[PDB]
Design an enzyme around this catalytic site. Structure first.
Site, PDB file in Angstrom:
ATOM      1  N   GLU A   1     -32.737  72.468 -70.028  1.00 29.68           N
ATOM      2  CA  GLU A   1     -32.062  72.344 -71.305  1.00 29.68           C
ATOM      3  C   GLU A   1     -33.108  72.034 -72.357  1.00 29.68           C
ATOM      4  O   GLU A   1     -33.811  71.020 -72.233  1.00 29.68           O
ATOM      5  CB  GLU A   1     -31.016  71.235 -71.252  1.00 29.68           C
ATOM      6  CG  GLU A   1     -29.901  71.512 -70.263  1.00 29.68           C
ATOM      7  CD  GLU A   1     -28.862  70.414 -70.187  1.00 29.68           C
ATOM      8  OE1 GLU A   1     -29.064  69.354 -70.809  1.00 29.68           O
ATOM      9  OE2 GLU A   1     -27.834  70.617 -69.502  1.00 29.68           O
TER      10      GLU A   1
ATOM     11  N   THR B   1     -29.851  71.429 -62.798  1.00 28.78           N
ATOM     12  CA  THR B   1     -31.302  71.318 -62.760  1.00 28.78           C
ATOM     13  C   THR B   1     -31.731  70.448 -61.591  1.00 28.78           C
ATOM     14  O   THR B   1     -32.099  70.963 -60.535  1.00 28.78           O
ATOM     15  CB  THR B   1     -31.823  70.742 -64.080  1.00 28.78           C
ATOM     16  OG1 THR B   1     -31.467  71.617 -65.151  1.00 28.78           O
ATOM     17  CG2 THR B   1     -33.332  70.592 -64.031  1.00 28.78           C
TER      18      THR B   1
ATOM     19  N   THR C   1     -18.902  61.989 -63.557  1.00 26.08           N
ATOM     20  CA  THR C   1     -18.755  62.804 -64.754  1.00 26.08           C
ATOM     21  C   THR C   1     -18.894  64.292 -64.442  1.00 26.08           C
ATOM     22  O   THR C   1     -19.247  65.095 -65.312  1.00 26.08           O
ATOM     23  CB  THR C   1     -19.766  62.359 -65.807  1.00 26.08           C
ATOM     24  OG1 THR C   1     -19.794  60.930 -65.832  1.00 26.08           O
ATOM     25  CG2 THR C   1     -19.312  62.804 -67.180  1.00 26.08           C
TER      26      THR C   1
ATOM     27  N   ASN D   1     -25.009  54.590 -61.111  1.00 26.33           N
ATOM     28  CA  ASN D   1     -24.766  53.964 -62.403  1.00 26.33           C
ATOM     29  C   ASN D   1     -23.727  52.859 -62.310  1.00 26.33           C
ATOM     30  O   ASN D   1     -23.732  51.945 -63.138  1.00 26.33           O
ATOM     31  CB  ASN D   1     -24.311  55.008 -63.418  1.00 26.33           C
ATOM     32  CG  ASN D   1     -25.237  56.188 -63.482  1.00 26.33           C
ATOM     33  OD1 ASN D   1     -26.300  56.123 -64.094  1.00 26.33           O
ATOM     34  ND2 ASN D   1     -24.845  57.283 -62.842  1.00 26.33           N
TER      35      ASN D   1
ATOM     36  N   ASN E   1     -31.629  52.701 -67.910  1.00 27.05           N
ATOM     37  CA  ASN E   1     -33.012  53.177 -67.914  1.00 27.05           C
ATOM     38  C   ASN E   1     -34.005  52.019 -67.958  1.00 27.05           C
ATOM     39  O   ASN E   1     -35.052  52.052 -67.298  1.00 27.05           O
ATOM     40  CB  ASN E   1     -33.221  54.113 -69.106  1.00 27.05           C
ATOM     41  CG  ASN E   1     -32.363  55.359 -69.020  1.00 27.05           C
ATOM     42  OD1 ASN E   1     -31.507  55.472 -68.145  1.00 27.05           O
ATOM     43  ND2 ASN E   1     -32.577  56.293 -69.937  1.00 27.05           N
TER      44      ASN E   1
ATOM     45  N   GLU F   1     -49.206  51.827 -46.653  1.00 24.77           N
ATOM     46  CA  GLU F   1     -48.687  50.748 -45.819  1.00 24.77           C
ATOM     47  C   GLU F   1     -47.202  50.510 -46.076  1.00 24.77           C
ATOM     48  O   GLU F   1     -46.436  50.192 -45.152  1.00 24.77           O
ATOM     49  CB  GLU F   1     -49.483  49.472 -46.081  1.00 24.77           C
ATOM     50  CG  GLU F   1     -49.014  48.286 -45.284  1.00 24.77           C
ATOM     51  CD  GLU F   1     -47.999  47.451 -46.030  1.00 24.77           C
ATOM     52  OE1 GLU F   1     -47.318  46.628 -45.382  1.00 24.77           O
ATOM     53  OE2 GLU F   1     -47.868  47.635 -47.260  1.00 24.77           O
TER      54      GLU F   1
HETATM   55  N1  GTP Z   1     -28.890  55.784 -64.961  1.00 22.98           N
HETATM   56  C1  GTP Z   1     -28.863  56.908 -65.878  1.00 22.98           C
HETATM   57  N2  GTP Z   1     -28.105  58.135 -65.518  1.00 22.98           N
HETATM   58  C2  GTP Z   1     -28.069  59.293 -66.453  1.00 22.98           C
HETATM   59  C3  GTP Z   1     -28.744  59.232 -67.657  1.00 22.98           C
HETATM   60  N3  GTP Z   1     -28.552  60.385 -68.295  1.00 22.98           N
HETATM   61  C4  GTP Z   1     -27.769  61.174 -67.509  1.00 22.98           C
HETATM   62  N4  GTP Z   1     -27.480  60.483 -66.370  1.00 22.98           N
HETATM   63  C5  GTP Z   1     -26.652  61.053 -65.313  1.00 22.98           C
HETATM   64  O1  GTP Z   1     -27.302  62.415 -64.750  1.00 22.98           O
HETATM   65  C6  GTP Z   1     -26.313  63.133 -64.280  1.00 22.98           C
HETATM   66  C7  GTP Z   1     -26.416  64.593 -64.839  1.00 22.98           C
HETATM   67  O2  GTP Z   1     -27.742  64.943 -64.778  1.00 22.98           O
HETATM   68  P1  GTP Z   1     -28.283  66.194 -65.689  1.00 22.98           P
HETATM   69  O3  GTP Z   1     -29.790  66.149 -65.716  1.00 22.98           O
HETATM   70  O4  GTP Z   1     -27.719  66.135 -67.107  1.00 22.98           O
HETATM   71  O5  GTP Z   1     -27.826  67.611 -64.962  1.00 22.98           O
HETATM   72  P2  GTP Z   1     -28.963  68.757 -64.614  1.00 22.98           P
HETATM   73  O6  GTP Z   1     -29.683  68.410 -63.331  1.00 22.98           O
HETATM   74  O7  GTP Z   1     -29.941  68.836 -65.777  1.00 22.98           O
HETATM   75  O8  GTP Z   1     -28.209  70.216 -64.468  1.00 22.98           O
HETATM   76  P3  GTP Z   1     -27.848  71.092 -65.820  1.00 22.98           P
HETATM   77  O9  GTP Z   1     -26.899  70.295 -66.691  1.00 22.98           O
HETATM   78  O10 GTP Z   1     -27.215  72.394 -65.390  1.00 22.98           O
HETATM   79  O11 GTP Z   1     -29.125  71.369 -66.586  1.00 22.98           O
HETATM   80  C8  GTP Z   1     -25.036  62.465 -64.764  1.00 22.98           C
HETATM   81  O12 GTP Z   1     -24.430  61.837 -63.717  1.00 22.98           O
HETATM   82  C9  GTP Z   1     -25.518  61.415 -65.790  1.00 22.98           C
HETATM   83  O13 GTP Z   1     -24.591  60.254 -65.810  1.00 22.98           O
HETATM   84  C10 GTP Z   1     -29.532  57.959 -68.039  1.00 22.98           C
HETATM   85  O14 GTP Z   1     -30.110  57.909 -69.077  1.00 22.98           O
HETATM   86  N5  GTP Z   1     -29.570  56.832 -67.136  1.00 22.98           N
HETATM   87 MG    MG Z   2     -28.223  68.837 -66.818  1.00 22.00          MG
END
Ligand code: GTP
Ligand code: MG
Ligand code: TA1
Ligand code: GDP
Lengths: 436, 290, 187, 158, 428
Positions: A71, A145, A179, A206, A228, A254
């Protein structure tokens, strides 16, 4: 000499990387513009940032990281943000199109054409490292992704190195809060490929960390940046022993030898303590025994797992700040006399403890307060099979109707992948049971 | 003999960390991160520098005393007399001065563009090389000079990669190496012309490995002594006079005064029946070792 | 420019399909015109440049002089329509020695003449649409007996219709080419 | 007159007296993997750099805005019995007297390393002498005609 | 004459060696600069046992510092007594030990021994009459155990006549800072028994108690523990260094303590040990020093003497005293606790004595005992080993270095054979 290569794939990966590479540049005094001032220098000194940076020919410190994403929109926010003078633009890899929560689009169609430049960037970045301690992956299972890339990435990484060790920090689909609607599919699909390739893989979700920030810090308005920050704190406490001094140093070699008894069983829990605001720390003393009890408390974990339904095949403690070894030896003795905590028979030992004298730092505007002590707990407990069985159940509850299967079978997959990942998860659960 | 790949990192760490010794001051101009390609400077390494001595500091020759004396002082109004008055060595030449070694080699440029099939192999018990292809089928004519041209490097990991590249190619080379000799003289001479101890102690061990790598390499090298021995003649007598002090440093190869003696013995060993006179012509102090 | 980038299988410098194809190109017109029209044979957009006085209407690849197009891929391929007019194009090359050669190909020329800095050569264009591939590394070896390092500038003069300009790094076949990097002439 | 520096076995701190209470807050010294048994400590005229002797023989000069460490000690050697009696001459230089009788003058102006420009040298030694016995106390007397007269009490009661 | 070369393996071994070399450097009165600033001539008569001369009247230790991961070697170099080591007496590698005895003894050990042996040979020949060796292990880590034993085996087949000491720190029975620790213990023991002559065993747990009860220390850091190991390690050799009315070389301590070739695991203790308060009231006489040493607490090993009998013991005094008192003290003790000794050995203590005491003290002593109580220690480990080896836990790391399972089974059986011998001579 002691350096790591930190990948961040997906959105959650590169979001947590924001906090991680802010915490590091603050802990080492690096300014957002690449270079630290001349005051912070102490005569002749290195290896304080060598682990997380490379000093250029003059001035700048460029972080030895990678931000891969499909993205464009988050890598663009990073490119335009305040931490843009840090990264050389060729680090942040982007793509015109996303995976759209499809493991097929991640692993067979779109990532197949950018792994080549990812591997070339990794080549150029790992030849720069004399002693490579390891790759640290920041995957996020449950997105397109993450699921497809991290898997294809690890396949290529294992066919290249193999012997080199990969540690992963994955977020896992929380059982209640989720989600996505198809994410059991991609979780099941990612596991079969990751287990065989990665060497150690922590897990967190989360939900547990929302609960932690509610309980301890008392924040009714948590967002993703709060999670984060805690992930960054955990990783700083972990990579302390690599980048700092102190009794009982800890190196990844180790640390992975004495926590993974069997090749398959390497998934492990996490925990951090103390984790409090300013007013709370003001009415406390924070003994090492208090902190280790907080760490070993099952409610303070960062994964929705109950350890009291299983045993501890081993554990690992990494203190920080003002600690002495007699205190740790007394705390572990108290804990091993305790009864609620079980330990499998064949490990009468089981506590790898590490210390160091560099106290934890607080990021201005953050949520945590300043403390002279800290503990991160990492344990390979056999109780975690419940969060695997949840998804084992969910996968087939959906696969029986064969919903969403058309996306995957049109994007360069078939049906057999599901069945093979199902068999792998069943075998994994049987293996987890076998150790009782 | 002993390898050159491993020794270098441990030596640099022992020198810089353990002792208070200096790097010393390796110029890294034009080179930024590991991602941005450097801007290659037009300068050349091992280049003799012009004489910087002023006009007037040159003493004048007094026809009356047969001596070079410094010129007298021009008056100055500020320094006027008051009431009370009752009362040339030549500018040395940079013979042993380390020349400037810019990072503008060809190996760095090729590695930057990513045309090399090499990579570092961390999975081994130490730093090893990892080839994308098979060594014994490479084009030595194109690659071997490039690898020699990186010996002059000091910035990591370029110098490690370059030394390990030649070290591994000379083992499997065999007959493929002999026709490449006319193209290896320029980088070897350029590496020696730097006067820097690190690059010199490395290239001398590589030169030993070179004459040993195959047969008939000695006679083929013999005509090229006039371009590689001139530096041998300088550091041939740079040794350590410890007396009773046992040389623990002998564990690694650092003493030029004998790293040159071993190499000259090896040259006379392999050159045939006429290498001795071609050596004695360049380095006159040499003594036949047969 | 294009330094410290990634060129492994292809590198497209110009594409008629896009929000702004002449991102990096400088365009100079004196008695001509540049536009993007929909071709009839290949039913898509093609960027056409035309005008009298071929030597004056052209487009240079780097936006400005004193800025080089560092690209190390041997093969260079253009996709052009043949309008049966005077068409020429030039490509500057850096040899292994620090000398900037330049080769040009013209359809109004009949003899090749090697020179210290230039090599003019005829081009026998086909009718209508055709892709032309330059080895660009055999050429330097055949002309000056040296080795190819990296292209510096590209320039295309008037009376042609461009669709694709891309470096290939090897002679790919009609099968191995992806969908975008090929000539699919519909009915 | 609200902050004060104190050194000891394996610790250096700067304490500031808080105004709101009867407390004083310390800030510890951060030195790169250095374990030195500090013996004597002096502060310059303008609170820029704190100089501190050492049983090893170094004279560590540290900045005081932040207390981190800057320069090690006397180049071209090392004091024999460790630095014991240290004092400052108003010109900015330091008198150092070790536990053997070596009394020397180190000019402490931040210098760049000649060979390596982005690096500092160590403190050179302007003058040096030998007195009988370990030096323990140094006091100043401004004569200002040529230099300064320092009363030096040595462990041998001289 | 009688010069001795000193080796330090592992992080701990390199750390206690930083104290042992700091304590001794003050005993003979030399500086961190390496220059001598003592007063007497006894500082110089037998200085050559621990040092080599240097240009300009400096003294450098006859030490070797072996450890992977050179990060630790920057520490000891940066300590207040790092400037005396020759910076080429530093062998190291960038790769880690990882607490895997295999790689420390099979892969990454074999890469360094050829260099170490080059260094030890260099200063083995720097001694007119080399007395013996001595090392500093840590049976938990992979460097100490893995590299140490591999080195020792090499020395034994090169200097058979000479004698090898070992101040190996054993793992703790209750405390286990690592998890694969019993694997590192048993595998090392399979090497030491046949490839050593004297092997002190020491445990940090007993070092914590001694610092807690006796010394009344609130926070014993690792320095204090190392400060104790340093104290005893100097006490063993004062005969070789200083005059003594009854001097005891190390070879005569051997023959008087190991009646059988395999029973060479000792048990050590130091005295006097008091706090700062008790120092004011206690008086320093031979009686105090011998009751304190014969106590079951001063034993720095995690073993109870009362569960065994002393096959043989030996006490070393230093400080101007009367030889008659120490002669009858060891007699009375031999009479009263007649159950704590054996019958087939008529007199089973040797009472050496030196003429020069420690630096600031006036009387001191050191206890060394070859009791059958140590058999407890090996019993314990032999369970934790057979606990996980029964489950093959963590074993895949060890197969990853070309090892096999026979190596463990042979190793375990070696201890069970050993501890069996400690029972035969313990007739309860
Ligand atoms: N702990 C934490 N979880 C996050 C955060 N941002 C996104 N997530 C979680 O990451 C998950 C989605 O991951 P994404 O990276 O958006 O999905 P992707 O792997 O990129 O796949 P595509 O959307 O097709 O590009 C969801 O469950 C989010 O709640 C964050 O800042 N902190
Ligand atoms: Mg994504
Ligand atoms: C006024 C006075 O007598 O003070 C003593 C003292 O009170 C006591 C408590 C000392 C003191 O020791 C300690 O406080 C201590 C702390 C942690 C661990 C061990 C000791 C002393 O430090 C120890 C020191 O003893 C020595 O110097 C020994 O010779 C000892 N030295 C060192 O270990 C040493 C080395 C380098 C730098 C500093 C000390 C030694 C022992 C064997 C072989 C060689 C040297 C002295 C006399 C004292 C103090 C200063 C309080 C004691 O130590 C020794 C070994 O003497 C602790 O038990 C003894 C009994 C002493 O009475
Ligand atoms: N007396 C003392 N013991 C230590 C110290 N540090 C570690 N130890 C112990 O030594 C063991 C670790 O050995 P180590 O050398 O660090 O690992 P290795 O490099 O693989 O050999 C552990 O049992 C530690 O508890 C120290 O500083 N002092």
């Amino acid at each position: 000499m002691r350096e790591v290569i930190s990948i961040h794939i997906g959105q959650a990966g590169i979001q947590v990387g924001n906090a991680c590479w802010e915490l590091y540049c603050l802990e080492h005094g690096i300014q957002p513009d690449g270079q630290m001032p001349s005051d912070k220098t102490i005569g002749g000194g290195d290896d304080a940032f060598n682990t997380f940076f490379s000093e250029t020919g003059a001035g700048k410190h460029v972080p030895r990281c990678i931000f891969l994403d499909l993205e464009p929109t988050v890598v663009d926010e990073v490119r335009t943000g305040t931490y843009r003078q840090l990264f050389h633009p060729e680090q942040l890899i982007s793509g015109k199109e996303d995976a759209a929560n499809n493991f097929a689009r991640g692993h067979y169609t779109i990532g197949k054409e950018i792994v080549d430049l990812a591997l070339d960037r990794i080549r150029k970045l790992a030849d720069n490292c004399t002693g490579l301690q390891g790759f640290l992956v920041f995957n996020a299972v449950g997105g397109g992704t993450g699921s497809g890339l991290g898997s294809l990435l690890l396949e290529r990484l294992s066919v290249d190195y193999g012997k080199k060790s990969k540690l992963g920090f994955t977020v896992y689909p929380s059982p209640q809060v989720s989600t996505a609607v198809v994410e059991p599919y991609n979780s099941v699909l990612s596991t079969h490929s990751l287990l065989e390739h990665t060497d150690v893989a922590v897990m967190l979700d989360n939900e547990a960390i929302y609960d932690i920030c509610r309980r301890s810090l008392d924040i009714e308005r948590p967002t993703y940046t709060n999670l984060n920050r805690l992930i960054a704190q955990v990783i700083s406490s972990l990579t302390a022993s690599l980048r700092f001094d102190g009794a009982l140093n800890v190196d990844i070699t180790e640390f992975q030898t004495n926590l993974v008894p069997y090749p398959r069983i390497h998934f492990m829990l996490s925990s951090y303590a103390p984790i409090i605001s300013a007013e709370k720390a003001y009415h406390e003393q924070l003994s090492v025994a208090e902190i280790t009890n907080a760490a070993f408390e099952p409610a303070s974990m960062m994964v929705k797992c109950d350890p009291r339904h299983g045993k501890y095949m081993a554990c690992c403690l990494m203190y920080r700040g003002d600690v002495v070894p007699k205190d740790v030896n007394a705390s572990v003795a108290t804990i091993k006399t305790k009864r609620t905590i079980q330990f499998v028979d064949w490990c009468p030992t089981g506590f790898k403890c590490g210390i160091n004298y560099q106290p934890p730092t607080v990021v201005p505007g953050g949520d945590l307060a300043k403390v002279q002590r800290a503990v991160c707990m990492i344990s390979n407990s056999t109780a975690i099979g419940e969060i695997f069985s949840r998804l084992d159940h969910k996968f087939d509850l959906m696969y029986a109707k064969r919903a969403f299967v058309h996306w995957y079978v049109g994007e360069g997959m078939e049906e057999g992948e599901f069945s093979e990942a199902r068999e792998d998860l069943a075998a994994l659960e049987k293996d987890f049971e076998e150790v009782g | 003999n002993g390898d050159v790949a491993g020794s270098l990192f441990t030596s640099t760490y022992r020198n810089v960390k353990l002792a208070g010794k200096a790097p010393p001051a390796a110029n890294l101009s034009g080179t930024g991160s590991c991602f941005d390609t450097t801007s290659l400077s037009p300068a050349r390494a091992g280049a003799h520098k012009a004489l910087d001595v002023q006009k007037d500091e040159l003493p004048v020759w007094s026809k009356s005393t047969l001596s070079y004396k410094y010129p007298a002082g021009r008056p100055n109004p500020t320094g006027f007399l008051k009431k009370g008055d009752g009362e040339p060595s030549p500018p040395q030449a940079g013979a042993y001065k380390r020349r400037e070694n810019p990072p503008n080699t060809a190996f760095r440029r090729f590695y930057e563009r990513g045309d090399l099939p090499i990579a570092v192999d961390h999975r081994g018990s130490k730093n090893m090389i990892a080839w994308k292809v098979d060594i014994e089928k490479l084009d030595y004519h194109h690659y071997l000079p490039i690898f020699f041209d990186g010996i002059r490097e000091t910035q990591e990991p370029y110098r490690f990669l370059a030394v390990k590249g030649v070290e591994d190619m000379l083992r499997v080379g065999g007959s493929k190496i002999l026709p490449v000799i006319p193209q290896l003289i320029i980088p070897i001479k350029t590496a020696l012309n730097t006067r820097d101890h690190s690059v010199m102690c490395i290239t001398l061990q590589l030169l030993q490995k070179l004459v040993l790598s195959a047969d008939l390499v000695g006679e083929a090298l013999v005509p090229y002594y006039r371009q590689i021995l001139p530096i041998f003649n300088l550091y041939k007598n740079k040794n350590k006079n410890l007396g009773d002090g046992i040389d623990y440093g002998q564990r690694n190869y650092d003493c030029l005064g004998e790293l040159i003696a071993d190499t000259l013995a090896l040259f006379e060993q392999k050159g045939g029946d006429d290498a001795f006179i071609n050596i004695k012509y360049m380095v006159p102090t040499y003594e036949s070792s047969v | 420019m294009f330094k410290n980038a990634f060129q492994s299988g292809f590198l497209s410098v110009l594409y008629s399909i896009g929000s702004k194809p002449l991102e990096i190109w400088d365009k100079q017109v004196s008695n001509g015109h540049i536009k993007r029209i929909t071709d009839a044979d290949i039913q898509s957009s093609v960027l056409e440049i035309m005008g009298q006085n071929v030597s004056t209407t052209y487009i240079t690849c780097p936006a400005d002089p004193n800025k080089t197009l560092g690209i190390k891929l041997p093969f260079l391929v253009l996709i052009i329509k043949n309008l049966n007019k005077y068409f020429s194009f030039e490509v500057q090359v850096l040899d292994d020695k620090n000398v900037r050669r330049r080769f040009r190909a013209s359809n109004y020329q009949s003899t090749t003449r090697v020179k210290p800095f230039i090599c003019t050569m005829p081009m026998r264009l086909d009718s209508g649409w055709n892709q032309i591939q330059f080895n660009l590394s055999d050429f330097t070896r055949r002309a000056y007996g040296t080795n190819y390092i990296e292209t510096l500038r590209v320039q295309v003069h008037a009376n042609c219709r461009i669709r694709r300009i891309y470096f290939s790094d090897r002679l790919y076949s009609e099968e191995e080419l992806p969908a975008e990097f090929k000539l699919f002439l519909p009915i | 007159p609200d902050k004060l520096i104190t050194a000891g076995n394996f610790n250096m701190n700067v304490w500031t007296y808080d105004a709101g209470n009867n407390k004083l807050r310390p800030t510890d010294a951060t030195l790169g993997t250095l374990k030195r048994v500090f013996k004597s400590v002096v502060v310059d005229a303008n609170d820029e750099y704190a100089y501190c002797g050492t049983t090893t023989g170094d004279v560590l000069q540290i900045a005081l805005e932040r207390v981190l460490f800057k320069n090690t000690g006397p180049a071209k050697g090392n004091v024999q019995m460790g630095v014991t009696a240290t004092c400052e001459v108003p010109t900015g230089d330091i008198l150092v007297g070790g536990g053997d009788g070596s009394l020397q003058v180190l000019r402490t102006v931040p210098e760049p390393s000649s060979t390596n420009p982005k690096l500092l040298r160590k403190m050179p030694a302007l003058a040096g002498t030998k007195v009988e016995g370990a030096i323990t106390s140094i006091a100043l007397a401004d004569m200002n005609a040529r230099g300064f007269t320092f009363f030096v009490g040595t462990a041998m009661c001289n | 004459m009688r010069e001795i070369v000193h080796i330090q393996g592992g992080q701990c071994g390199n750390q206690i060696g930083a104290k042992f070399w700091e304590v001794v450097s003050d005993e003979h009165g030399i500086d961190p600069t390496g220059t001598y600033h003592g007063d007497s001539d006894l500082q110089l008569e037998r200085i050559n046992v621990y040092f080599n001369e240097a240009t300009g009247g400096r003294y450098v230790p006859r030490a070797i510092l072996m450890d992977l991961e050179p990060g630790t070697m920057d520490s000891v170099r940066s300590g207040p007594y790092g400037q005396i080591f020759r910076p080429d007496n530093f062998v190291f590698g960038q790769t880690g030990a990882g607490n895997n005895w295999a790689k420390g003894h099979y892969t990454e050990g074999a890469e360094l021994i050829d260099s170490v042996l080059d260094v030890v040979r260099k200063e083995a020949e720097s001694c007119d009459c080399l007395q013996g060796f001595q090392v500093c292990h840590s049976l938990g880590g992979g460097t100490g155990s893995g590299m140490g034993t591999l080195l020792i085996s090499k020395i034994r087949e090169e200097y058979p006549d000479r004698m090898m000491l070992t101040f190996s720190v054993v793992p703790s029975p209750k405390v286990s800072d690592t998890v694969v620790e019993p694997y590192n213990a048993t595998l090392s023991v399979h090497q030491l028994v046949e490839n050593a002559d004297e092997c002190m065993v020491l445990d940090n747990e007993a070092l914590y108690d001694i610092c807690f009860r006796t010394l009344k220390l609130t926070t014993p850091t690792f320095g204090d523990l190392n400060h104790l190991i340093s104290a005893v390690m100097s006490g063993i050799t004062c005969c070789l260094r200083f005059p003594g009315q009854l001097n005891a070389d190390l070879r005569k301590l051997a023959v008087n303590l190991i009646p059988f070739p395999r029973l060479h695991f000792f048990m050590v203790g130091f005295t006097p040990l008091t706090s700062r308060g008790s120092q004011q009231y206690r008086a320093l006489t031979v009686p105090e020093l011998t009751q304190q040493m014969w106590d079951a607490k001063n034993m720095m090993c995690a073993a109870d003497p009362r569960h065994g009998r002393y096959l043989t013991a030996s006490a070393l005094f230093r400080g101007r005293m009367s030889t008659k008192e120490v002669d009858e003290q060891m007699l009375n003790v031999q009479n009263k606790n007649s159950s704590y000794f054996v019958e087939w050995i008529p007199n089973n203590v040797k009472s050496s004595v030196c003429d020069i005491p420690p630096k600031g003290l006036k009387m001191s002593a050191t206890f060394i005992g070859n009791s059958t109580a140590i058999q407890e220690m090996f019993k314990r480990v032999s369970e934790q080993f057979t606990a996980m080896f029964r489950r093959k836990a963590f074993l895949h790391w060890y197969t990853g270095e070309g090892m096999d399972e026979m190596e463990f089974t042979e190793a375990e059986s070696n201890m069970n054979d050993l501890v069996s011998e400690y029972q035969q001579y313990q007739d309860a």
